Homo-oligomer: A and B are copies of this chain.
Amino acid sequence: FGLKHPPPQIMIKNTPVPANPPTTFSPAKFASFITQYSTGQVSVEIEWEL
């Protein structure tokens, strides 16, 4: 089936958790994060005509 307005794309992401920052302020880009992942359950349900 071709659709002008198909089911939209759901996007998911893990927010970045910074590691311990330097004691003295630095304007440099923060590039030391805590490594972690995520898991969960996803349910889908489609009603179809016959």
Contact = CB atoms under 8 A, between A and B. Distances in A.
- Copies of this chain, how many? 2
A17 interface: yes
Nearest to A30: B39
Interface in A1-44: 15, 17-18, 20-21, 35, 37, 39, 41
A20 B34 CA distance: 13
Contacts of A20: 35, 37
Contacts of A18: 37, 39
A17 B39 CA distance: 7
Contacts of A15: 41
Contacts of A17: 39
